[PDB]
Symmetry: C3
Subunit: 191 residues, 3 copies
């Protein structure tokens, strides 16, 4: 009976790093989590079917386009749970033109059946500051207000995921320099 | 079924207007939706049963089966949608005296399944102020701390709806004097 | 219809005394709702098994063991509600090292089928003093910010519950020295 952890965040919050750096310290101790990336789940199956041209042209497609390739990673990742403790790096909601789209709607929530959901946070100002220094990608650097509104809906969604699955919801805080503090807490929650 | 859109917001925030005005402009575009005030769609159930008269003793009505009424109206709109894209002017939660009442309960929610939920928001001060100008209704005059509260719990409903039904949650701001901007927001989300 | 009322408030807020007082008055005027305390109930399930020596340290167990016990207690009360209306005393979310474990997952909400979910609230300054002036316990005395984060997620928990069960979500304030505003406002919705 293995453990599925969901690590959610707004872009540029550092969900991924904190996760990766968390499993590495764990690997050496005994606990070999997976590093699935729920977004890339659907991008191994996307250029493969001609909907994007990279990993930043997927949330500029229509609602009916993404919501097919979702319920598929849903059990495809669930499969991987019949092998090892998973850590599904995903998004509580998704910023799109149509509005906040749930990153794990009920049908994906049953398929995955999480034991813990985690909402990595920080200020919009710090998030924004981080979005700029990351040469590795393109960030909206939108206003603080939109960050907070997102981070607000991310909580109400995270909590519903906990209601529906019984998953406990952890809120990790991740400050500049203090990223070590987010790992270790993601660790006490992972162990 | 088809494309179904639910448009919500506390009394006074002007969600009804934003909806009519959009579908006025939409009707001249050769695409045709459907105004439906969930409120009166369920008034037809009222007198046909003689349970209360007013459209007031229905959030103030005997709480057994306020839900009965609520239930039926929600699947009546159901078929109203296979036929045409629908737009449902309603509320996320209804501030009855037993607390907030979820406009779209689990059942009605499934019995409808919108592809979009829309949350219309503005300051308590302005909401309050529009209520003074709504002479069309026998309005109440509540505090702002409590308007803000209700808009809180609304967003939460609204997001629990999204998850349960894969629908996108859009928060559309509708400030004083700027009716048309929210109209443009509603619309480009309907397309 | 037999009436299941749920009442929640972070530890320290006064959910218990609120419901206590609310019933004396009700019991000395006809309806004694059954006074039932979710944690008292499930403690009795744990001590008997040895998993807990004190009621206090059950939330420091593992989530999954907490959910087990929790589920047994949810169905102990379910049979309690076949034969008398029950104001059940519980929590929107429990605070654990692994985050906010819900207080009524979907399967538990199904069990009780509450009609009203009530949230008791107040400032985290006021609560922190209630926690110090309470001999009957051994409180851990946490940060203000951590109380509002819990009281936040509580609201989204308790809102989730409304959308699933169709219960009404009543929010109720218990300030210092004003213990009897809560009692009376509870009854007013309790009867
Ligand atoms: N389940 C779902 N359903 C439907 N669609 C889904 C979905 N899940 C994903 N998608 C789709 O997938 C696409 C991809 O998502 P998108 O958000 O665009 O990229 P991502 O794969 O999800 O990664 P992030 O954007 O979240 O970057 P990150 O900050 O979280 O991680 P990291 O810390 O390593 O990023 C680098 C950051 O590290 C942080 N960092 C690095 N060094 C430091 C430091 N020294 N101090 C503090 N922070 C640091 C910085 O903030 C830096 O920016 C989206 O279009 C989305 O629509
Ligand atoms: N889901 C469901 N379940 C259970 N019950 C349900 C239900 N759905 C509905 N009901 C029931 O239906 C009943 C009421 O019907 P319903 O119409 O659904 O709710 P309501 O309380 O009566 O809503 P209002 O008409 O008062 O507010 P509004 O913002 O929609 O009105 P308007 O667009 O005119 O805006 C207000 C005024 O401000 C003006 N205004 C001024 N400036 C602006 C501007 N800047 N933008 C927009 N409007 C402006 C507008 O012109 C207008 O005059 C309730 O009892 C409720 O129980
Ligand atoms: N659904 C679920 N799922 C999984 N686990 C669950 C669960 N539900 C419960 N649990 C578990 O069960 C346990 C729950 O224990 P629980 O039953 O919840 O604790 P308790 O013994 O009742 O006391 P609390 O710590 O809960 O404080 P309270 O404020 O709620 O009650 P009170 O008003 O009397 O506090 C009284 C004190 O506050 C003060 N006070 C009250 N009102 C006022 C007033 N207005 N002015 C001044 N002081 C006041 C007085 O000083 C008094 O001393 C947890 O460990 C958890 O594991």
């Amino acid at each position: 009976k293995n453990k599925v952890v969901v690590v959610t965040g707004v872009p540029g919050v550092g969900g991924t790093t904190v996760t990766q750096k968390a499993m590495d310290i764990l690997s050496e101790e005994g606990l070999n989590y997976k590093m699935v990336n729920f977004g890339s789940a659907m991008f191994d199956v996307a250029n493969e079917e001609g909907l994007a041209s990279d990993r930043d042209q997927m949330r500029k497609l229509d609602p009916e386009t993404q919501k097919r390739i979702q319920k598929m990673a849903g059990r495809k990742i669930a499969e991987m749970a019949k092998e090892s403790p998973v850590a599904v790096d995903t998004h509580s909601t998704v910023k799109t033109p149509k509005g906040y789209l749930p990153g794990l709607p009920a049908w994906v929530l049953t398929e995955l059946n999480p034991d813990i959901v985690i909402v990595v946070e920080t200020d919009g100002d710090e998030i924004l500051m981080r979005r700029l220094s990351d040469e590795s990608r393109k960030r909206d650097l939108e206003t603080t207000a939109s960050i907070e509104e997102h981070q607000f809906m991310n909580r109400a969604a995270a909590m519903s995921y906990g209601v529906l699955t019984g998953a406990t919801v952890k809120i990790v805080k991740n400050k500049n320099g203090l990223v070590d503090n987010a790992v270790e807490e993601l660790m006490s929650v992972l162990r």
